[model samples]
Target: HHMNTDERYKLLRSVGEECIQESELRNLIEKKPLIRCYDGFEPSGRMHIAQGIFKAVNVNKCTAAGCEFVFWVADWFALMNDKVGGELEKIRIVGRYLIEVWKAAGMDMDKVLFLWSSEEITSHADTYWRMVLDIGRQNTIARIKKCCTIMGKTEGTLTAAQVLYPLMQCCDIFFLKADICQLGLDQRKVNMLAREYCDLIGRKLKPVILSHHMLAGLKQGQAKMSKSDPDSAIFMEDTEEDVARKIRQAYCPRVKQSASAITDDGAPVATDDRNPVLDYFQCVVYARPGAAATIDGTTYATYEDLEQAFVSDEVSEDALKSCLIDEVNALLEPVRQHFASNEEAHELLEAVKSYRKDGATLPLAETALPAAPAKPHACMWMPALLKVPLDVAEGMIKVTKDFIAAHPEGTVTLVLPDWSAVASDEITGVEKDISAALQVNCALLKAYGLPSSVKIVTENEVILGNCDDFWVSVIGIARKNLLSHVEELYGGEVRNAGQVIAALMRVATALMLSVSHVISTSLDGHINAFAREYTKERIDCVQTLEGRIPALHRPDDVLYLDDNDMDIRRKIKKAYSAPNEEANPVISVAQHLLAQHGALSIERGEANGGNVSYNTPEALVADCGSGALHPADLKAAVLQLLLDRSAQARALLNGELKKNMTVLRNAEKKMAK
Candidate 1:
């Protein structure tokens, strides 16, 4: 059908609310070469008309444009979002169910490549994660935080995974090597995110997006059709009778009842904002390639013809209602029939039904959070951990330290970062979700209850606070409080991801993180879990709040220190004397990381060890300040350490950074000039 540029261009703009680089898309299609398109789904529940018929209508057009489509089944994303009852196995089962569905709904498998995130990620795990970290490097955390909308979650209630979701989603565009991204208007944010990043990374990779409009639900209050609310949208499993009954009662607007509305290009349309009836004809019906839409033996050839007729009050409302019903049922009937007949589809459905949520039903914290061995976060150097600057970092961190007393057999850990302008403001959205996640882990606590056991510790206690349970005191590291810039975000809006982790971490220290003392603590435990479950890095102790996620922070200028040059001087001075010694945190970490591992050279003195290249960091650390190893050699080295370690803290400014620690480290290791 994509016989000409006009034909393909018409198809590209058919279903979506808008397209990015429309002129570019037209030119690309005009070239008459095969182009690829991409889109994804999480496979959470039964597919609805919006996901089923509407998406099918849209995807069909991409095929019409001579574009190969990559349909990403987000099984890993489902698990990350706690979807498909939040189980990997259950989510994967649903992913397969979806494949059968698209096949039944007119997908050309030969032209349409279906890739699952878990399957592709495992095969290309290194590239995928590296891509994720690079995307995080490309955008600001605030910008990334705003992209949380891509996960269907508000900005405030973000998890590390939720934040990473958009990053990876954007990465999917490049990884699939798709030229265009065709997703719902709700997904426009992330597609644009991908567009910007492609520009940043620059393989001359400027992907265009064709974001389709979202469908309003049949219900009065619901804004968009969601599987979460079954009544809001009709499901593929519905019988013909079920479809008729639902659409008969659905919310289609009267012709004269049109309220205010605006199209993407600032054009006015006489329509209701939440009108399912108008939404169907405009978004679904017209999006198809047919000459007309037939309803109960009556036909409306074009959307304009149908819209005007409705406004003229000539055709009855019952006629319009009947039309929607007939089309929707007709669209889904084959899918239902296929599932009914296919043994594989039947088994998958049964699995979805039998699959209960881990914590909500047959509750188990282990089910929510696996009790795998997690390591402690390594190298916690907060601008002189032993209190050098004497400026004093004071914050009371509540701790139990007795978690192993209960879960001597298990461990759980939460990461709390040391933020600055030391970050502030109260938060909302994620407070509820994080609480739920923690409760899932500490479900064993059984208050009404949940980390290693992580039930919510409600009572705020003074230094000697006690609990009906065995609770202890927390030692808030009293170092120089950065009081840096936490309150500055969103009129104190985001209240922030790091803060959410802090509150969660305080409660968990008594439950999971402390329990992990037997296994790991903070990031050590955090990294241990992901490294074993997720990394290629030689993850020893991951350090407290060592950000594997660019969620709460970026990974540039990772080393944390004061805003002054003095703090950098003293911090490294101590390290110079101890140079090669393990006790020297700065030299120990900097030399080993930057020198030995990173291969980032500062300078060499002509005395004890003046060689441009030392045999090892052990040799360099031993020589620095020891054998005419001018402490000045490390002044810049320690300065580099501060800039590097504060990566998370200075993340807002990281977008402009010249060197990324991870990238630089990789470069240094490879010694690729």
Candidate 2:
């Protein structure tokens, strides 16, 4: 049953908007014993018309060309995107529903292998993770962020979990051993990542990308159909009436002379603008097997004929739309019947409908609330920095105070990550670093009058206390995430093995804690997501004071608790306070101090816009930004505010705090050199 090479290429070519290296595809078709085409879905929401009918047509074309299709049910990937509230069980249910849709949508099941990422990766955990690590090792976090567009997200919108997504997807190509990467044009970036990975590993064969066209939405200028907006596109399970309504409402502008229809490339365009009605005819209806469009007692066997008839006014807009409505309903009838007659399919529909209506259903394991702790313990991380910045110290103190006030019985444990420092080899002279970390923790607590219940302990103390469980938790977290995830959390550079392990320990610290709730400076989202996946404990992060004190240069121009009045004035003078108030360090510090002290009283001479008592930082910044308040006066006011604020904390900085400050400063200078 050997088909001609050109004939097979022709079949697969019909499914693509663009094909990468047509020669390679032809060569593989003739030489390879089997070609496995990969298509993955996140099961994020309802299956739109493009996702269902168009996808099915593409899959059929691939399989017809003697290719085996592996449908990856990316349930874990969906969870990472926080789809359906990051609930895996809900995501799985949605995934099964997606498979059921494909089954009834006339998708060829004979040559299809439906695989769940959770189950498949679990069974072959070691190999899959190894591929993920190897891929991540070769690529930078910047490179991975570029591929984030595949997830329908941008760099600014990504969670730490979402950052690992592209890395896992690149690994999926090699793990599944797929020869062709068959996904939409939007997914071509990640598919290219897979090809790039093939080169990185020195593999002979690269996954040929057959990127399909994404169908535009029914509305004018809608670009692509949206799953969230019900009116944008018809769902797979949409009723006959729903299909008709959407088809009738679709953007179908009739063509006249076909002059406006010509594109810059000299190809006849679909319409003046993107017309979803014509797009459906070409992509879905015409692509379907044995498809025909009969309008006004005339039969159009091909999409071109239908297009010719519509553009020439042989068939009116209403006539074409009516025919499309009927055709879509005919295609959907079997799917509706499948859900209606089949018990499992019927139950899946009901569940998905309820899930959409009621919002996210709490996972079965999470429905029953855990018993509250006897003393309401909360853990906070104290980073093993040389010294805590003024903003960090103040923010942590405020959060601690509020937590204690809210829960009178609440006891906050300051976790010093000395183990992380030691393991990652982040600092030389470990004793002094640890000493500085502890002294910083204690001095801040002492300055802020923290209760004795606010105990401080190192990571070594916690891990060594329950070494067995800590390692188990670490392994569990490690398996659930890629090496890239830890690398990103560790500040996203090429990392040593201990640095990755040290990053893992950050999450494990939460799992090993006996407390009911955990708090941290940052890494809350990653920590909580991992905690939810691996443990029962809930981890919350303090919404620390937003915006950092921007500097002209590091160390020297930044804010420190130990900075004297003269030092504060000098730093403020050199600070990067541009006209743009958004990123101005002086304005940010002014805002923080104004919020705390309720007013920023500016002392100015009568000539220099006299003394202005600005109640809001907003007013102050606007005047300074608009040249209403002179730069010199604004700097003077900011200097006074910094001095006023630091004065209180500086009062209690002595003994161990003073000694450790010198030690931390010395270490910083040494590291800087």
Candidate 3:
């Protein structure tokens, strides 16, 4: 039988031949193409010290042995137990970074098949399920329970997915046609199961070559080195200085001779009676040597002599320990240099930070934190002559004005269309659109109530123009136009118009205050008014309808309405139900549509329920007859109705003067009390 061609194995056998039996050695050497090596890591956290060393050594050993090496990136598994935070992009980036690190670690990419669990084996989920069912037929519950205990699943409660994790792991061996699977001692049970599974499926399964090693912790005689316990293990990422510091603090006790080994057992066994430093020298340095040694004043040329001197206390413990530290540093220097100089290795560190930063923004309630302080609002104003309905435009203006008034410190700016006027071969541009200019002035007037504090100015010869001057002019025009509209709407009985304008302006002001506090402060009151109007007209139709349907029907007639009224009520109910349904879909067919196309035009009757109820299906039928419920008209009506109801509610709740005299005076008193 031809022996495998791996140099690491030859080296290992030279030093530790007794670790593997003769038959086991023959099997490993003769397996040839039937023997393969596999390793996997979850691309969740940073690829730190332990990972680098383990992967490096594993890759070196596998490559030397002429074994097919498979490195699986466990991205899907990372999502299984919340190993990675819930950002898929973060996981992908981490995976990419890890691949780079693997390459930088001297693994020949051409020889190793690098696979991602998420992408390569997603289709294998079904195959895994089938394998599990087959296994369940032969495996007893007791056996499975024992396996779980070994795998650390002692919670007494197991999820189906968790129970099947081993099965999936085993399936990977068969799926890849790997002959000899290799893994840590922790995975022995899984590997054994895979062999059994291969047998049950009538496939020739290769014997596993378990290359296990004892972990030497900082404490001389400790069981294992653990990452969770920082003091116990020296991380691969540690700098030279850090390594020195940790070694200095390590618990190296004096070697002790066991009474039984010396007397009853009659065996010359090494003891911990020597100091920690000496113990390391005896164990590590003497095991692999090119150094001069002396023990108890006798000079030794070979490791055998050093070992004998160690047993006899011929060498001082301190001297032995000093030599050990040097040897340990020599072994670690290459790894340290690799980490420091490798750009791809550094990218793994960067990936960790990036993962945390992006993962912090998950929408899950458990992951999300409280909102931060509100910032200034960014405002965008549509010009008046954009084919937008006058009522819709007016509603937008009213909403913006109310918001501005509410927020005293909040900014209010206007955007208007300016037509260029050519005078003497020079284009003298009219600053902004005339209608938009008028609307802006209207918004300011609605915001201020009593206006004319600023006058509208037009230049005979347009001299110089800047954003500041343009905004000032827009604000001036908006104030003037607002006063004009208020006079027209409420009638020029100056005091009454002023009172009405002031009330509306107060509403606008409060909205502006809310806008400043909720959305942004950079925005002027008009923007708030615009948002409120937009929200009322397009966003809040359902709410408006809900409010109106109840109020429109008399209390006595509520249960006794005619067929026509019932139809209207049904339509109202449908409107109310539509939003809730579309807002959350079971199948989500419209998800792509919603993402591709922006938010749809606001439906009717959806507004702040406390304010006006605008155009809704029910409202359109009630106001303009059922035939008037064209899509756009219905949307507009819903918006208008919501705005009206919301504004009224705000006024009533905040104790503003009632625009309608029909409301009983006692109503305010009762509500206030």
Candidate 4:
């Protein structure tokens, strides 16, 4: 029940895949009698062994190490994710069932406290939201989007509530006064966000992070167990027979392998070929009290000994599988008994199962895109058409396509911030550059077959039309943020007062336009935070495309939209190709750009795999990696696709949009000089 500093640190450290800082954790253990450790869960579905039993083992270790564990019942977070059809009532029932499972699964209840986010946040809503905004103010849209994986989401087309999930979760650490964030490796991004937030506010003591390992499911290539799949994992309340049946069908291969491989940065390295049965043996079987495995009258005391015997053929696959089923059944017996014997537990389980019978989708409804305004506005800045390569054009056209689909009646406005460009650059003839950028970009959009609903606007028009409102909003935003904050927004790579002013002005334009959604292959954090703080609602509904097109590093390897057909051919010929590297530009452009438009085919003689048409980019990349498709052949296919995709755009630069030629000529001169 008691431990020294070293003993406590060792116990808690063993619970994680890795700790953020061993020194910080040691000092905390030595200094504090009760370290407040936080872990959270969304009560959206049934609990798996990892969440129920594995988490209990870790929690018991923390409590034994003199830590008071706080479990966040993230019902509101679930609602934000539209989990369980966004039904709060069912969400709360699931939350209670989760706590019950943990209680019965051997967590030290005296040292644990479960706090409902919806209830607790309301009690201290002001301070909570203030911290959320403060964290939001310090971060960018791209930075925060990276943290979306914490809630099992990607950066693609997030609902407004889903986007706010990271800020709220980051604030949960400080709001609860947690000394340590104890979550799985998947939640590490937002935890880092919390620590970075500490530095932003000039807080002296940053919260330490203890990220645990996520358990692989019973299937091959399953990184973690899913509650939706009954056979993928063993639930807490599963019968003995069910556990044996699943264990028998589990992915177990006869090979020596390790699952807990970590990169230098502490992220998990995939060992897809590793046996999931052994994963269970290491994480579950050996982690139990008095762990041991006996097969064919051979007793192995530790996981390593058992693994060696199994791998060396001293123990057969059937022996290990049979042993695992028996060991797991014995371990789960108490859990099953608790549910069967306890009235409240039985009632909760019945309610959960009964609700599912009626189906969680009963309340499910499609999320509608925001309603179109009288004069609908959505603006994307045209940075510079000179750097607009074929890949970048593809991304821009995709953004417009998606936006128009989302808001059919709305128009896409390309904002040419001519004044901002002049402020940030040393270039003269601002009028010519703006005119060129508009003509070149608009022409590309038109050539790509976009509808006539697209419009071209300028910073001059926005500022001139609403002189008082626009400037006042700009001044208000500047006043609210520190000069340091604004500098950081331009990404802190280089300092420029002109760039800072220009960035603030851009934020003001979004406000003035009252844009419904800022859809692009990028993130601007300021616009979202500013609109929410200044107005009745956060009008800027910023949605980012999933992946941006990658640009080639070398000059000769790059393919610009304005490049002549001969130039395109030469660039593709010279482009880099890697057999194994996923980031190879030739492979990337083919994957990210070429695949989007249509199927790509490479023609070859009968001996060399003949003619092949790739239905997906993944197939193309895989063939290239496997050497089934040669680099020369891939280049030929990509070159054809690029030429086909950009032919119309290139023609316009020489024809109707030829007015853009002045800027292009200047750009060429500047490049040559």
The candidate maximizing lDDT is 4
Model 3, 1-673: lDDT tens digits are: 3443454457333322122243554456555553466766667554543354444555555555566678767664454433555344567777776666555544565567878765655455444433433454344333443444223344253332233345456667666666455554445566666666657667753445353332345655543454346655555455667667766777655444222211111112223442344334443444342545544456677655665555567665455555555656665666456657877666665556654564433442111111221543323233322122222333444445554565545443332212211110011111222333333333333332312222222221121233223322222222223333333332432222112222233223223323223222211223233333423432111000011122222112221111122333343333421221222111121222222233322343544322233322333224333233233343344434334423422343224322221232233243456
2 versus 3: better TM-score goes to: 2
lDDT tens digits, residue span 1-673, model 4:
4566778788989888879998999999989988999999888787778888788888888988889999988876776666776556667888888888777777888989989987887666446644555565456655765776777665564323243577788989999999999999988888888888888778999999999987877887676776567888887778888998999999987777654655433344335676878878877778765678888888899888998898888888998999989988876888788879999888998888886765553556322222335655677776444545555555666678777887777778777776555544424324466556655765675676655666778776776666545544554455445444554445543222344446666767776666765544443434334333334454555554544445555335566556766787786676777555545777777765545657777877798779988778677766777658777887777778778877887787678767667666776686588
Candidate 4 stretches with Cα past 4 Å from truth are 157-161, 259-270, 358-673
Could you give candidate 1's per-residue lDDT for residues 1-673 as a string of tens digits?
2166676687676645677788878877877477888888887766777777777777777776787888888776665555544445556777777777778987666678888776686566546644655566445557767776566666663234255567678888888887888876667777777778766767674888777666777877666766556677787788888888887888766654343342322222223445677667666667666646665555687777777777788676788888877777777878878778988777776766676334343352112222423533211111202111111111001122233344354433333222111211111112232233222212211211112333223222211133212111111110101112222212343434333223222322333223323123332223223222211223322222222211112111222222234444454444433433333444444544553245656665566556464447666655664454555565556567555554443442233221333332342343334
In candidate 3 the C-alpha lDDT for residue 537 amounts to: 37
The C-alpha local distance difference test score for the whole of candidate 2 amounts to 0.70
TM-score of each: 0.58, 0.58, 0.43, 0.56
Number of the candidate with higher lDDT, 2 or 3: 2
User: lDDT of all predictions, in order shown?
Assistant: 0.52, 0.70, 0.41, 0.71
lDDT of 1 at 28: 76
The order of the candidates by lDDT, greatest first, is 4, 2, 1, 3
For residues 1-673, what per-residue lDDT tens digits would candidate 2 score against the true structure?
5657787889888787778888888888888766899889888878888888889999998898898999899877776565665556677888888888888998998999999887887666556754555565556556666776677665672234354577788889888888988988777777877888777668887889887877767887576776557878878888998998988988887752221321112122233467778888887788986888888788998888898888888888999899989988888889999999999899998988887765544442111122334567677766556544666667677777788888887677787776555544545535556657565755664554555667878776776676545644554465456555555544565444445555576667765555656665653334334443344434444554434544544237677556655777787778766553444566676777777778778788896577878787567756875557666777777777667656756654555467666777677777889
Once superposed on the true structure, which residue ranges of model 1 sit more than 4 Å away at CA? 157-161, 256-273, 294-298, 356-673
Using TM-score as the measure, the top candidate is 2
lDDT of residue 451 for candidate 3:
27
Pairs that collide, model 2: none
